[PDB]
Amino acid sequence: AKNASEVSELLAKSLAEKAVVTEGGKVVEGFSYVSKAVAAKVIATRRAEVHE
Amino acid sequence: EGNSVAGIIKSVNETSGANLLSSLKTIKAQAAPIYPAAASSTGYSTQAK
């Protein structure tokens, strides 16, 4: 029960990391989106391998 | 004996960005020209004798 906050946080995060995209309540399967943070790591990779 | 620039060009290209500036004095020295070292004398050779 001392690490009960840990399992409660991970229980949300497992549902949240594979969060699904709903259009009008309808789930669109095969909807691939690239994050703003994922795309900003593609930039910082590309900026660092050009700077080197 | 390849030339010194294509050794500089290769060994800078195959050096990652983290260890680049540490490894620049070992590329400066690997492509410095040879100046042969002074042996001890043992002078007065056969044509000087």
PDB file of C-alpha atoms in Angstrom:
ATOM      1  CA  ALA A   1       0.000   0.000   0.000  1.00  0.00           C
ATOM      2  CA  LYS A   2       3.004   2.333   0.175  1.00  0.00           C
ATOM      3  CA  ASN A   3       3.503   1.775  -3.575  1.00  0.00           C
ATOM      4  CA  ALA A   4      -0.233   1.907  -4.311  1.00  0.00           C
ATOM      5  CA  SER A   5       0.188   5.330  -5.913  1.00  0.00           C
ATOM      6  CA  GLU A   6       2.717   3.753  -8.272  1.00  0.00           C
ATOM      7  CA  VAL A   7       0.362   1.096  -9.642  1.00  0.00           C
ATOM      8  CA  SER A   8      -2.449   3.649  -9.948  1.00  0.00           C
ATOM      9  CA  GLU A   9      -0.271   5.972 -12.027  1.00  0.00           C
ATOM     10  CA  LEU A  10       0.946   3.140 -14.260  1.00  0.00           C
ATOM     11  CA  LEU A  11      -2.628   1.906 -14.747  1.00  0.00           C
ATOM     12  CA  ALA A  12      -3.594   5.208 -16.340  1.00  0.00           C
ATOM     13  CA  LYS A  13      -0.367   5.476 -18.342  1.00  0.00           C
ATOM     14  CA  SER A  14      -0.757   2.067 -19.964  1.00  0.00           C
ATOM     15  CA  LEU A  15      -4.160   3.105 -21.284  1.00  0.00           C
ATOM     16  CA  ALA A  16      -2.879   6.566 -22.209  1.00  0.00           C
ATOM     17  CA  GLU A  17       0.240   5.667 -24.183  1.00  0.00           C
ATOM     18  CA  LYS A  18      -1.766   3.545 -26.616  1.00  0.00           C
ATOM     19  CA  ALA A  19      -4.646   6.020 -26.702  1.00  0.00           C
ATOM     20  CA  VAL A  20      -7.002   5.567 -29.625  1.00  0.00           C
ATOM     21  CA  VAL A  21      -8.310   8.267 -31.977  1.00  0.00           C
ATOM     22  CA  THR A  22     -12.089   8.716 -31.986  1.00  0.00           C
ATOM     23  CA  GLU A  23     -13.672  10.756 -34.756  1.00  0.00           C
ATOM     24  CA  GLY A  24     -17.312  11.125 -33.746  1.00  0.00           C
ATOM     25  CA  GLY A  25     -17.146   8.555 -31.020  1.00  0.00           C
ATOM     26  CA  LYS A  26     -16.363   6.098 -33.803  1.00  0.00           C
ATOM     27  CA  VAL A  27     -12.894   4.622 -33.444  1.00  0.00           C
ATOM     28  CA  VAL A  28     -10.912   5.008 -36.653  1.00  0.00           C
ATOM     29  CA  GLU A  29      -8.655   1.975 -36.862  1.00  0.00           C
ATOM     30  CA  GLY A  30      -5.395   2.308 -38.702  1.00  0.00           C
ATOM     31  CA  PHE A  31      -5.116   5.965 -37.740  1.00  0.00           C
ATOM     32  CA  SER A  32      -1.413   6.688 -37.450  1.00  0.00           C
ATOM     33  CA  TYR A  33      -0.436  10.042 -35.983  1.00  0.00           C
ATOM     34  CA  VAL A  34       3.045  11.371 -35.244  1.00  0.00           C
ATOM     35  CA  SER A  35       3.324  13.459 -32.081  1.00  0.00           C
ATOM     36  CA  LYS A  36       4.638  16.969 -31.704  1.00  0.00           C
ATOM     37  CA  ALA A  37       7.247  15.542 -29.345  1.00  0.00           C
ATOM     38  CA  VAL A  38       8.069  12.600 -31.597  1.00  0.00           C
ATOM     39  CA  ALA A  39       8.491  14.915 -34.580  1.00  0.00           C
ATOM     40  CA  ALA A  40      10.624  17.262 -32.498  1.00  0.00           C
ATOM     41  CA  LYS A  41      13.017  14.424 -31.782  1.00  0.00           C
ATOM     42  CA  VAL A  42      13.294  13.655 -35.500  1.00  0.00           C
ATOM     43  CA  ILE A  43      14.343  17.279 -35.946  1.00  0.00           C
ATOM     44  CA  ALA A  44      16.857  17.267 -33.098  1.00  0.00           C
ATOM     45  CA  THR A  45      18.355  14.062 -34.456  1.00  0.00           C
ATOM     46  CA  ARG A  46      18.597  15.562 -37.926  1.00  0.00           C
ATOM     47  CA  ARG A  47      19.984  18.849 -36.601  1.00  0.00           C
ATOM     48  CA  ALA A  48      22.659  17.068 -34.600  1.00  0.00           C
ATOM     49  CA  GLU A  49      23.829  14.730 -37.340  1.00  0.00           C
ATOM     50  CA  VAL A  50      24.145  17.660 -39.722  1.00  0.00           C
ATOM     51  CA  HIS A  51      25.949  19.763 -37.150  1.00  0.00           C
ATOM     52  CA  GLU A  52      28.473  16.992 -36.689  1.00  0.00           C
TER      53      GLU A  52
ATOM     54  CA  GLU B   1      51.970   5.038 -48.527  1.00  0.00           C
ATOM     55  CA  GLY B   2      48.745   6.954 -48.995  1.00  0.00           C
ATOM     56  CA  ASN B   3      48.566  10.672 -48.668  1.00  0.00           C
ATOM     57  CA  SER B   4      48.080  12.492 -45.405  1.00  0.00           C
ATOM     58  CA  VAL B   5      44.881  14.309 -46.286  1.00  0.00           C
ATOM     59  CA  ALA B   6      42.928  11.202 -47.229  1.00  0.00           C
ATOM     60  CA  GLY B   7      44.001   9.807 -43.881  1.00  0.00           C
ATOM     61  CA  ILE B   8      42.779  13.000 -42.214  1.00  0.00           C
ATOM     62  CA  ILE B   9      39.590  12.877 -44.258  1.00  0.00           C
ATOM     63  CA  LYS B  10      38.919   9.226 -43.429  1.00  0.00           C
ATOM     64  CA  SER B  11      39.717   9.306 -39.723  1.00  0.00           C
ATOM     65  CA  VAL B  12      37.677  12.463 -39.189  1.00  0.00           C
ATOM     66  CA  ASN B  13      34.741  10.913 -41.052  1.00  0.00           C
ATOM     67  CA  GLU B  14      34.891   7.744 -38.938  1.00  0.00           C
ATOM     68  CA  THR B  15      34.839   9.607 -35.639  1.00  0.00           C
ATOM     69  CA  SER B  16      31.597  10.226 -33.778  1.00  0.00           C
ATOM     70  CA  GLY B  17      30.524  13.676 -32.665  1.00  0.00           C
ATOM     71  CA  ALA B  18      31.183  13.120 -28.971  1.00  0.00           C
ATOM     72  CA  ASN B  19      34.824  12.065 -29.326  1.00  0.00           C
ATOM     73  CA  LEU B  20      35.654  14.420 -32.184  1.00  0.00           C
ATOM     74  CA  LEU B  21      37.420  17.268 -30.404  1.00  0.00           C
ATOM     75  CA  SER B  22      39.263  14.918 -28.077  1.00  0.00           C
ATOM     76  CA  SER B  23      40.554  12.950 -31.061  1.00  0.00           C
ATOM     77  CA  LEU B  24      41.848  15.868 -33.099  1.00  0.00           C
ATOM     78  CA  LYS B  25      45.404  15.883 -31.774  1.00  0.00           C
ATOM     79  CA  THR B  26      45.810  12.225 -32.698  1.00  0.00           C
ATOM     80  CA  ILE B  27      44.809  13.015 -36.274  1.00  0.00           C
ATOM     81  CA  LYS B  28      47.053  16.083 -36.296  1.00  0.00           C
ATOM     82  CA  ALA B  29      49.949  13.866 -35.239  1.00  0.00           C
ATOM     83  CA  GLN B  30      49.154  10.896 -37.464  1.00  0.00           C
ATOM     84  CA  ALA B  31      49.367  13.158 -40.516  1.00  0.00           C
ATOM     85  CA  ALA B  32      52.336  15.201 -39.392  1.00  0.00           C
ATOM     86  CA  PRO B  33      55.356  14.521 -41.618  1.00  0.00           C
ATOM     87  CA  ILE B  34      58.196  12.323 -40.482  1.00  0.00           C
ATOM     88  CA  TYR B  35      61.269  14.150 -39.274  1.00  0.00           C
ATOM     89  CA  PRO B  36      63.695  11.341 -38.477  1.00  0.00           C
ATOM     90  CA  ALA B  37      65.285  11.336 -35.085  1.00  0.00           C
ATOM     91  CA  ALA B  38      68.913  11.939 -34.236  1.00  0.00           C
ATOM     92  CA  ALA B  39      70.764   8.687 -33.717  1.00  0.00           C
ATOM     93  CA  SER B  40      73.913   8.604 -31.630  1.00  0.00           C
ATOM     94  CA  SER B  41      77.006   9.585 -33.541  1.00  0.00           C
ATOM     95  CA  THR B  42      79.382   6.663 -34.267  1.00  0.00           C
ATOM     96  CA  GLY B  43      81.124   9.194 -36.460  1.00  0.00           C
ATOM     97  CA  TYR B  44      83.937   9.116 -39.017  1.00  0.00           C
ATOM     98  CA  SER B  45      82.544   6.659 -41.556  1.00  0.00           C
ATOM     99  CA  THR B  46      84.619   4.724 -44.061  1.00  0.00           C
ATOM    100  CA  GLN B  47      84.695   7.524 -46.627  1.00  0.00           C
ATOM    101  CA  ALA B  48      85.731  10.014 -43.978  1.00  0.00           C
ATOM    102  CA  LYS B  49      88.414   7.629 -42.792  1.00  0.00           C
TER     103      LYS B  49
END
